Design an enzyme around this catalytic site. Structure first.
Site, PDB file in Angstrom:
ATOM      1  NE  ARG A 109      -2.279  -6.733  -3.363  1.00  0.00           N
ATOM      2  CZ  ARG A 109      -0.971  -6.716  -3.140  1.00  0.00           C
ATOM      3  NH1 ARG A 109      -0.159  -7.390  -3.972  1.00  0.00           N
ATOM      4  NH2 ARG A 109      -0.472  -6.060  -2.077  1.00  0.00           N
ATOM      5  CD1 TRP A 278     -15.762  -6.048  -0.046  1.00  0.00           C
ATOM      6  CD2 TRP A 278     -16.287  -7.247  -1.869  1.00  0.00           C
ATOM      7  NE1 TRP A 278     -15.110  -7.255   0.048  1.00  0.00           N
ATOM      8  CE2 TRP A 278     -15.420  -8.013  -1.052  1.00  0.00           C
ATOM      9  CE3 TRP A 278     -16.756  -7.801  -3.078  1.00  0.00           C
ATOM     10  CZ2 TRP A 278     -15.029  -9.324  -1.394  1.00  0.00           C
ATOM     11  CZ3 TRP A 278     -16.352  -9.091  -3.431  1.00  0.00           C
ATOM     12  CH2 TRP A 278     -15.499  -9.841  -2.581  1.00  0.00           C
TER      13      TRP A 278
HETATM   14  C1  HEM Z   1     -12.884  -7.200  -3.651  1.00  0.00           C
HETATM   15  C2  HEM Z   1     -12.825  -6.286  -2.694  1.00  0.00           C
HETATM   16  C3  HEM Z   1     -11.692  -5.334  -2.574  1.00  0.00           C
HETATM   17  C4  HEM Z   1     -11.305  -4.702  -1.431  1.00  0.00           C
HETATM   18  C5  HEM Z   1     -11.954  -4.856  -0.071  1.00  0.00           C
HETATM   19  C6  HEM Z   1     -10.234  -3.793  -1.786  1.00  0.00           C
HETATM   20  C7  HEM Z   1      -9.557  -3.000  -0.852  1.00  0.00           C
HETATM   21  C8  HEM Z   1      -8.745  -1.926  -1.246  1.00  0.00           C
HETATM   22  C9  HEM Z   1      -8.549  -0.759  -0.462  1.00  0.00           C
HETATM   23  C10 HEM Z   1      -9.152  -0.478   0.910  1.00  0.00           C
HETATM   24  C11 HEM Z   1      -7.719   0.076  -1.156  1.00  0.00           C
HETATM   25  C12 HEM Z   1      -7.233   1.441  -0.655  1.00  0.00           C
HETATM   26  C13 HEM Z   1      -8.007   2.591  -1.352  1.00  0.00           C
HETATM   27  C14 HEM Z   1      -7.750   3.970  -0.819  1.00  0.00           C
HETATM   28  O1  HEM Z   1      -7.309   4.166   0.336  1.00  0.00           O
HETATM   29  O2  HEM Z   1      -8.010   4.949  -1.578  1.00  0.00           O
HETATM   30  C15 HEM Z   1      -7.387  -0.619  -2.361  1.00  0.00           C
HETATM   31  C16 HEM Z   1      -6.514  -0.140  -3.316  1.00  0.00           C
HETATM   32  C17 HEM Z   1      -6.488  -0.712  -4.599  1.00  0.00           C
HETATM   33  N1  HEM Z   1      -7.127  -1.829  -5.067  1.00  0.00           N
HETATM   34 FE1  HEM Z   1      -8.414  -2.904  -4.093  1.00  0.00          FE
HETATM   35  N2  HEM Z   1      -9.866  -4.011  -3.060  1.00  0.00           N
HETATM   36  C18 HEM Z   1     -10.779  -4.841  -3.645  1.00  0.00           C
HETATM   37  C19 HEM Z   1     -10.872  -5.217  -5.002  1.00  0.00           C
HETATM   38  C20 HEM Z   1     -10.079  -4.673  -6.036  1.00  0.00           C
HETATM   39  C21 HEM Z   1     -10.261  -4.954  -7.402  1.00  0.00           C
HETATM   40  C22 HEM Z   1     -11.388  -5.798  -8.009  1.00  0.00           C
HETATM   41  C23 HEM Z   1      -9.222  -4.298  -8.061  1.00  0.00           C
HETATM   42  C24 HEM Z   1      -8.948  -4.261  -9.511  1.00  0.00           C
HETATM   43  C25 HEM Z   1      -9.304  -5.230 -10.349  1.00  0.00           C
HETATM   44  C26 HEM Z   1      -8.413  -3.608  -7.092  1.00  0.00           C
HETATM   45  C27 HEM Z   1      -7.275  -2.820  -7.348  1.00  0.00           C
HETATM   46  C28 HEM Z   1      -6.822  -1.896  -6.387  1.00  0.00           C
HETATM   47  C29 HEM Z   1      -5.831  -0.862  -6.745  1.00  0.00           C
HETATM   48  C30 HEM Z   1      -5.212  -0.738  -8.135  1.00  0.00           C
HETATM   49  C31 HEM Z   1      -5.606  -0.124  -5.625  1.00  0.00           C
HETATM   50  C32 HEM Z   1      -4.684   1.089  -5.429  1.00  0.00           C
HETATM   51  C33 HEM Z   1      -5.319   2.399  -5.930  1.00  0.00           C
HETATM   52  C34 HEM Z   1      -4.381   3.601  -5.835  1.00  0.00           C
HETATM   53  O3  HEM Z   1      -3.146   3.479  -5.877  1.00  0.00           O
HETATM   54  O4  HEM Z   1      -4.844   4.768  -5.691  1.00  0.00           O
HETATM   55  N3  HEM Z   1      -8.929  -3.897  -5.851  1.00  0.00           N
HETATM   56  N4  HEM Z   1      -7.990  -1.898  -2.413  1.00  0.00           N
HETATM   57  N1  LIG Z   2      -6.204  14.316  -4.297  1.00  0.00           N
HETATM   58  C1  LIG Z   2      -5.834  13.343  -3.579  1.00  0.00           C
HETATM   59  N2  LIG Z   2      -5.026  12.425  -4.138  1.00  0.00           N
HETATM   60  C2  LIG Z   2      -5.373  11.125  -4.324  1.00  0.00           C
HETATM   61  C3  LIG Z   2      -4.458  10.231  -4.895  1.00  0.00           C
HETATM   62  C4  LIG Z   2      -4.821   8.892  -5.074  1.00  0.00           C
HETATM   63  C5  LIG Z   2      -6.093   8.446  -4.683  1.00  0.00           C
HETATM   64  C6  LIG Z   2      -6.489   6.996  -4.878  1.00  0.00           C
HETATM   65  C7  LIG Z   2      -7.877   6.675  -4.322  1.00  0.00           C
HETATM   66  N3  LIG Z   2      -8.488   5.542  -4.996  1.00  0.00           N
HETATM   67  C8  LIG Z   2      -9.893   5.195  -4.772  1.00  0.00           C
HETATM   68  C9  LIG Z   2      -9.920   3.708  -4.521  1.00  0.00           C
HETATM   69  C10 LIG Z   2      -8.955   2.971  -5.162  1.00  0.00           C
HETATM   70  C11 LIG Z   2      -8.947   1.580  -4.961  1.00  0.00           C
HETATM   71  C12 LIG Z   2      -9.885   1.020  -4.109  1.00  0.00           C
HETATM   72  C13 LIG Z   2     -10.861   1.775  -3.461  1.00  0.00           C
HETATM   73  N4  LIG Z   2     -11.774   1.189  -2.627  1.00  0.00           N
HETATM   74  C14 LIG Z   2     -12.301  -0.007  -2.906  1.00  0.00           C
HETATM   75  N5  LIG Z   2     -12.720  -0.801  -1.925  1.00  0.00           N
HETATM   76  C15 LIG Z   2     -12.394  -0.412  -4.343  1.00  0.00           C
HETATM   77  C16 LIG Z   2     -12.537   0.257  -5.546  1.00  0.00           C
HETATM   78  C17 LIG Z   2     -12.525  -0.629  -6.633  1.00  0.00           C
HETATM   79  C18 LIG Z   2     -12.349  -2.005  -6.345  1.00  0.00           C
HETATM   80  S1  LIG Z   2     -12.211  -2.099  -4.614  1.00  0.00           S
HETATM   81  C19 LIG Z   2     -10.882   3.145  -3.666  1.00  0.00           C
HETATM   82  C20 LIG Z   2      -7.000   9.340  -4.117  1.00  0.00           C
HETATM   83  C21 LIG Z   2      -6.639  10.668  -3.943  1.00  0.00           C
HETATM   84  C22 LIG Z   2      -6.295  13.249  -2.145  1.00  0.00           C
HETATM   85  C23 LIG Z   2      -6.474  12.209  -1.227  1.00  0.00           C
HETATM   86  C24 LIG Z   2      -6.947  12.629   0.028  1.00  0.00           C
HETATM   87  C25 LIG Z   2      -7.164  13.997   0.173  1.00  0.00           C
HETATM   88  S2  LIG Z   2      -6.745  14.719  -1.351  1.00  0.00           S
END
Ligand code: HEM
Ligand SMILES: N=C(Nc1ccc(CCNCc2cccc(NC(=N)c3cccs3)c2)cc1)c1cccs1
Ligand code: HEM
Ligand SMILES: N=C(Nc1ccc(CCNCc2cccc(NC(=N)c3cccs3)c2)cc1)c1cccs1
Ligand SMILES: C[C@H](O)[C@H](O)[C@H]1CNc2nc(N)[nH]c(=O)c2N1
Ligand SMILES: C[C@H](O)[C@H](O)[C@H]1CNc2nc(N)[nH]c(=O)c2N1
Ligand SMILES: [Zn+2]
Lengths: 407, 411
Positions: A109, A278
């Protein structure tokens, strides 16, 4: 009521007041902490609208001006009449940037103020959605120099005319259950892959097939569209030391783009709001590649490395994990596709927390998500106390559309 | 009410009802989660309900709830409280209470072992010399020449809060730390303040990198006294690597017996302020935390230099590479010397089985995810994928302020 968070490595203490603004609830109580659980009217709308406009006008140093009061009245009159209202472009941009700023589970962020917002509120059909999406993918990819972006489709009305992207990310690989009982491709996507097939997709039935988009406009039945292959930047995975690594045949895509979340601004709900940034290297190398329920490649890699897999205490899994992650970072860097390592990302987030504490009075952070899935305590976030709370505007989970949709 | 937790790797769903018995508060509310915060003289009035609830739990466990023995014991405790302001636990209740405090320790990954705990009753102790003797016996028993056995030694309970028994050491065996005039630290930086107190009290510091600290023991609210643990009782393991022959020349070693001495044990409203307990190490405690924390021994740089890794960019993952080699070294060394240690793979796998067992027989298992998940290789261990519910059950281990902050010096 004024709360302290300590960094146990640097001794730096920060005071949080921003949490007093929190409106939504956490799942926890005085008796039970649920910190590790993955998913814990006209009447309702005007307070939500007012709360938002107040912070927006405050952010531009116009709190209590006639321009502020007038807008409150205009939106008020609009809700009373139409039972909804429309955001000005400036408000929409602010709201989207703040939903990211408020995302307690996001380590990236520090970037929150550099977000390109694409207003797709004029969109009416699935082909229109497809066009906006390809434009977003091309803009954000920028030939490997990735740029953060969000595309915002029309807001929820009566709830029977929802715009949805059915995909969980814009770019993801198919999963197929095999006659054997094994799984080919990505096991996370098996069900969606079958939905595509049953909707009509000719699957290549390979290990890394880019899924088609399934797009729902105006509560209509969703339609299939292939993203032009030329817009999907992919990286072959090789190792800077191990020659045999490339023969594993690993690849990943460059653009992470979440498409199943709901953006809430000022009480208005945007059910299709795909956003992209990314990757942090661990997301691919640790989670996509090594999760048991994912590509689960740890066994095959350790075998190629000739490690002693007899006993867990040889730490063969851990050795193989580090090498897989070295290869992911090396491959993206070699191909000039933006990626961040977990050391750099977490260092950045600490700096961001410090900015937010001084400029804003706090920063909601979910420690369970922020700490990387490998090498936790050698990153500074491990030693940082964090307070988790929910601010709005926000990104929220919503039910997967296939359980909801009426065909 | 029922609460469900899901494992996201196995899809195993568990149902918790034990949380209904929880009384103590967490720090969280409906509006804030404080799950990553490190740290989030009783009346007769408050004492009898605490005693009653404990004795109901004890009597239930021995299948004698509502029996004549149960009722007579309640009445006897009641009479003891109203006349003497406090009460004494029977030996059996003490053992039950100490084991349950461990069973209930939500930040402990080793709880599969909770029912095998040797309890040493040191409630007849009166002097610091008496405490020294109890502690030496505990260390010798627990050490068992490398075949470590879990144990706890329990000194007399708090009375008026002015006569507390306390071990000033944070662990029974720990290395000294010395801050130099140029601002560097010799030895372990975590123990600088305590080392300084020892010196002031009269300890002759050897001033090396691994000097075992003296015990500083407070009996009966009196000024604490210094004792040296006989070195023959202090088992130590020189650290070497199975492949890297230069690893030994780093001069590293660690002690085999982890023994926490600064927690407070609460059983049925009674407060045991000196209750040192010991088990054995999980390898990451030494290899990740003691050796590689920036604020501890901080050996990552020197290890990666010797491995000749590319250190110009963090994205080579040189730290992650050096980290794995050190942790291999720690497990290799302990195993080679036949000193009990568990790796983080084995320890978390066992914990998951423990936790499922507890859900079936007990109705729950309070667990603190932030603490249970190991500090390296998080998501390749099964706990990372396990949802957990954290709540506080009594009997319990609790933090208490460092004794130098509160002690009334007699002189
Ligand atoms: C710019 C580079 C960015 C990096 C490196 C990054 C990094 C991450 C990472 C590593 C996660 C964890 C994802 C997971 O374990 O599934 C995450 C979650 C998240 N990021 Fe980012 N982020 C970036 C940009 C953004 C942008 C552009 C947005 C939205 C405008 C955003 C909104 C979120 C949200 C909402 C989550 C939580 C998703 C969930 O609860 O499943 N991020 N971020
Ligand atoms: N079904 C599931 N539940 C589940 C609940 C929540 C999520 C959230 C995963 N969100 C994908 C994500 C979200 C935000 C950021 C990223 N990675 C990025 N670097 C970005 C994506 C967009 C901007 S940055 C990936 C995934 C699985 C499981 C997870 C693992 C094994 S099963
Ligand atoms: C038998 C072998 C055992 C293993 C492998 C083990 C493992 C651990 C580990 C790794 C921690 C975290 C330590 C840290 O990061 O600071 C811990 C915490 C703890 N364990 Fe154990 N444990 C064992 C036995 C015991 C015993 C015998 C007791 C007490 C009777 C105990 C009570 C605790 C408590 C109270 C904590 C929390 C400490 C705190 O909050 O600061 N454990 N366990
Ligand atoms: N001063 C600190 N605060 C702090 C707060 C709490 C603790 C708790 C440490 N507990 C040591 C411990 C407890 C329980 C188990 C073990 N290890 C074991 N395997 C056993 C010990 C006894 C039975 S098993 C170690 C330590 C430091 C800092 C740490 C790092 C940077 S600052
Ligand atoms: C059950 C537990 O909350 C779950 O495994 C979490 C842990 N931390 C995480 N952290 C991130 N960034 N992503 C995740 O998917 C998870 N999974
Ligand atoms: C701020 C944070 O809660 C703190 O660094 C915690 C994180 N998890 C931990 N987990 C264990 N087992 N031991 C610890 O000392 C810590 N430290
Ligand atoms: Zn909580």
């Amino acid at each position: 009521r004024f709360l302290k968070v300590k960094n146990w490595e640097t001794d730096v203490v920060l005071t949080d007041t921003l949490h007093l603004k929190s409106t939504l609830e956490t799942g926890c109580t005085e008796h039970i902490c649920m910190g590790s659980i993955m998913l814990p009217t006209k009447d309702q709308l005007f307070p939500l609208a007012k709360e938002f406009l107040d912070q927006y006008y405050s952010s531009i140093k116009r709190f209590g001006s006639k321009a502020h009061m007038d807008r409150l009245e205009e939106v008020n009159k609009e809700i009373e009449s139409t039972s909804t209202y429309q955001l000005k472009d400036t408000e929409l941009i602010y709201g989207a940037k703040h939903a990211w700023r408020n995302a307690s589970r996001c380590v990236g962020r520090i970037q929150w103020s550099k977000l390109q917002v694409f207003d797709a509120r004029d969109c009416t059909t699935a082909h229109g959605m497809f066009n906006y999406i390809c434009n977003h993918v091309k803009y954000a990819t920028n030939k490997g120099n990735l740029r953060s972006a969000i595309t915002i489709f029309p807001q929820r009305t009566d709830g029977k005319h929802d715009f949805r992207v059915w995909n969980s990310q814009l770019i993801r690989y198919a999963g197929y259950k095999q006659p054997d009982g094994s799984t080919l491709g990505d096991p996370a996507n098996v069900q969606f892959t079958e939905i595509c097939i049953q909707q009509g997709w000719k699957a290549p039935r390979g290990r890394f097939d880019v899924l088609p988009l399934l797009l729902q406009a105006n509560g209509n039945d969703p339609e299939l569209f292939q993203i032009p292959p030329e817009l999907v930047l992919e990286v072959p995975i090789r190792h800077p030391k191990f020659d045999w690594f490339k023969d594993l045949g690993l690849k990943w895509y460059g653009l992470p783009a979440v498409s199943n979340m709901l953006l809430e601004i000022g009480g208005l709900e945007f059910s299709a709001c795909p956003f992209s940034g990314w990757y942090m290297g661990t997301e691919i190398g640790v989670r996509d590649y090594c999760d048991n329920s994912r590509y689960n490649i740890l066994e095959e890699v350790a075998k190629k490395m000739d490690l002693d897999m007899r006993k867990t205490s040889s730490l063969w899994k851990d050795q193989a994990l580090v090498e897989i992650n070295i290869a992911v970072l090396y491959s993206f860097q070699s191909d000039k596709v933006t990626i961040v390592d977990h050391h750099s990302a977490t260092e950045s987030f600490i700096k961001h927390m410090e900015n937010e504490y001084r400029c804003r009075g706090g920063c909601p952070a979910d420690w369970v998500w922020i700490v990387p899935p490998m090498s936790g305590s050698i990153t500074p976030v491990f030693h940082q106390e964090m307070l988790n709370y929910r601010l709005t505007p926000s990104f929220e989970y919503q039910p997967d559309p296939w359980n909801t949709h009426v065909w």
